[PDB]
Ligand binder design. Structure first.
Ligand SMILES: C=CC(C)(C)OC[C@H]1O[C@H](O[C@@H]2C3=C([C@H](C)COC(C)=O)C[C@H](O)[C@]3(C)/C=C3/[C@@H](COC)CC[C@H]3[C@@H](C)[C@H]2O)[C@H](O)[C@@H](OC(C)=O)[C@@H]1O
Lengths: 18, 221, 224
């Protein structure tokens, strides 16, 4: 059973506060 | 009452049903009561994905409209939804969130939202309507940017966040590469210096956002 | 008129706006004219993603619908999704009984539409409560079986549609009927006959077939 790993633009941010 | 909705919206979020989430968080807000940090984040994330879904569709259609009237109409169908979502947020902002905002952290955050959602309109603003739309965005950002300079440390994640977004505004919407880079470096270079103080965790929230600033700068030079 | 819908449908698809996509292709179906190979695919893909979004959400709500009163809350939302989900399923099933299956000309086409019928009845059984679960299970298995027999007669073992049908009816037995051995048997046959014929073929022209064949053995492996 494989449940394991395989398989350009500018960033903007929302601020999620504690 | 209200505690039910916040629990119900979080369910929508794990269920990736963002319209229901926005709908619920809309009700928690329309209460008139100032939002809890938890409540606010949930409002912001909900509407980020509702509007974000349209922005993606839009960028995709509009890129194919370039490479024909059918493509245009679909773009405009998207834009009308986009505009609704944005106004819906901006009204909630002007009616409920910003008047209630007490602390500087809250008043900046809601103003950066205001800028952000006006910025999303500027992404699709065509013709005459664009000039007026760009202005309320920059005024929104600017006001937040000023309060922030008064009340917050160079490494504060919200301030760092406002700088990142407001820089994009210059690069992309105003097409001012210089103002946009100039601002990002300001925010970033202050941070590195202040970064003696930081607790390991704070350091993490900060280094995270600072990494976004440099990521664009890298991309922009 | 129609053609524009087909292009608006391709547009919606790219925008990952699948609800508009299905909306478009439903109108093409309701034109009354029998669908083309392309148009069906767009229809199947449209409604597959449309029903799939709610199936995914549904799987998630129940995952945390495991517990006190927070378990009551998750239930109402599970029901909210289930109503949205059933409506979609019923919508497609109608188009099938009314427009798609009657006008079906090629055996290839009705195998396709009959496989759709089994599929969307299968989704109903995933959320079906006891009273109509047994009946809902039946309409699906009858649809598949009919599709399955037609396909054995008129479509070669490596035909993508015959294979897709084998895989889906295989899953049906396995999951809905809880008949693992019957499930492997149907899947194993379909696969071995497909392999046997594909060694005949220049496989590169059959990527969609080889893809499904890879789904078939993935289950055979897990079910063994
Ligand atoms: C590219 C997307 C569109 C245009 C929607 O078509 C999807 C695909 O449409 C065809 O493939 C079908 C098909 C799928 C193939 C497995 C795709 O294979 C590849 C290479 O990834 C998945 C889709 O759902 C589709 C249309 C559906 C079915 C299923 C439907 O029953 C109602 C039965 C099995 C399968 C049949 C109908 C396949 O023929 C073609 O053979 C594919 O062409 C290639 C490269 O193999 C194309 O990718």
């Amino acid at each position: 059973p494989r449940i394991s790993v395989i398989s350009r633009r500018r960033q903007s941010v929302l601020n999620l506060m504690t | 009452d209200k505690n039910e909705l916040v629990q119900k919206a979080k369910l929508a979020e794990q269920a990736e049903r963002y319209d229901d989430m926005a709908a619920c968080m809309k009700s928690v807000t329309e209460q008139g009561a100032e939002l809890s940090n938890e409540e606010r984040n949930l409002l912001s994330v909900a509407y980020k994905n509702v509007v974000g879904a349209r922005r993606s569709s839009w960028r995709v259609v509009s890129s194919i409209e370039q490479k024909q009237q059918m493509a245009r109409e679909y773009r405009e169908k998207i834009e009308t939804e986009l505009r609704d979502i944005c106004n819906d947020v901006l009204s909630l902002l002007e009616k409920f969130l910003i008047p209630n905002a007490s602390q500087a952290e809250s008043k900046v955050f809601y103003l950066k939202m205001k800028g952000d959602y006006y910025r999303y309109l500027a992404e699709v603003a065509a013709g005459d309507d664009k000039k007026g739309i760009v202005d309320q965005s920059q005024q929104a950002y600017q006001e937040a940017f000023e309060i922030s300079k008064k009340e917050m440390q160079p490494t504060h994640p919200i301030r760092l966040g406002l700088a990142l977004n407001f820089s994009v505004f210059y690069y992309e919407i105003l097409n001012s590469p210089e103002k946009a880079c100039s601002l990002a470096k300001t925010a970033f270079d202050e941070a590195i210096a202040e970064l003696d103080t930081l607790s390991e965790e704070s350091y993490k929230d900060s280094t995270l956002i600072m990494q976004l600033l440099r990521d664009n700068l890298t991309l922009w030079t």
